[PDB]
Amino acid sequence: LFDAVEKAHPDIFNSLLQILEDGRLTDSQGRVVDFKNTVIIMTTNLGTRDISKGFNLGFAAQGDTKSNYERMKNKVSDELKQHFRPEFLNRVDDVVVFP
C-alpha cells in the first residue's frame, strides 16, 4: 500500500513502472526481487476539492443536473491525468473513486 501518493515528489513512481508492467525490481546490489504475487494499492485525495460547492462562478440557467459522484469522477480523472505521466496511468489496472 502506498498511502497519500500525491504527497510525494512526482518522480518516486518512476520506479514503479517496472513493478507494474514487468513485475520486478532490482536493488542496488543487482538482485532481482519478484513482485508478481503482490497486490499494489495507491490511495489519493486528488480531485476532491469541489465537494463543498453548490455552483460554478459565472451565470447559469439550470444548475448541473449531474450528481456529486459524476462531478467527482470527472475531476478525479482530470487531476490524475494532469499529475501523472500517461505511461504510468497506462499500467494501473483499475481506478476506483470512493463516493
Binding site: 460547492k53 453548490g54 455552483f55 447559469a60 440557467a61 439550470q62 444548475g63 448541473d64 443536473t65 449531474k66 450528481s67 456529486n68 459522484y69 462531478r71 463516493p99
Partner: peptide, 9 residues
C-alpha cells in the same frame, strides 16, 4: 435567479 446543483450524493 441562482439555482444550486443536484447535491445528491
Amino acid at each position: 435567479t441562482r439555482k444550486m446543483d443536484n447535491s445528491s450524493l
